[PDB]
């Protein structure tokens, strides 16, 4: 499936 | 509705006589209680 650090929100939305 | 009275109902006509009555009055009262036969001939 998918990696947890890609599902996470604090590190994915790192540069809004 | 044209109906032939077979009795005397004093309200509308005499015995053996053709007269115009309302359809429900012929259907529900007269024909189920005698007193009238439709003009089938």
């Amino acid at each position: 499936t998918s990696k947890w650090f890609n599902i996470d929100n604090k590190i994915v939305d790192h540069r809004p | 509705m044209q109906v032939i009275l077979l009795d005397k109902v004093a309200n509308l006509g005499s015995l053996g006589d053709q007269v115009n009555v309302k359809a429900g009055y012929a259907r529900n009262f007269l024909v189920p209680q005698g007193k009238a036969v439709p003009a089938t001939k």
Binding site: - | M1, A23, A26, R27, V31, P32, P38, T40
Partner: protein
């Protein structure tokens, strides 16, 4: 079912057409009523689910004739 016992009228489908012609499905239902007809041949009251057009057919033709027709078509009453 909403089927007339005498004339066989059943619901039919059509459309609601508005002022802007928007078509949506709808049903036309017959004017069914359960009426007790006095049959003289049997000295009996027979209850029929019949429309008002069917009631007019009853009054024209005679209850005995349409009871014979119903018995020929096989449905109970």
């Amino acid at each position: 079912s909403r089927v007339c016992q005498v004339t066989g009228k059943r619901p039919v489908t059509g459309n609601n057409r508005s002022h802007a012609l928007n078509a949506t499905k709808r049903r036309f239902l017959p004017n069914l009523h359960s009426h007790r007809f006095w049959v003289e041949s049997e000295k009996r009251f027979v209850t029929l689910r019949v429309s008002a057009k069917g009631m007019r057919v009853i009054d024209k033709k005679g209850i005995d004739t349409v009871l014979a027709e119903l018995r020929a078509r096989g449905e109970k009453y």
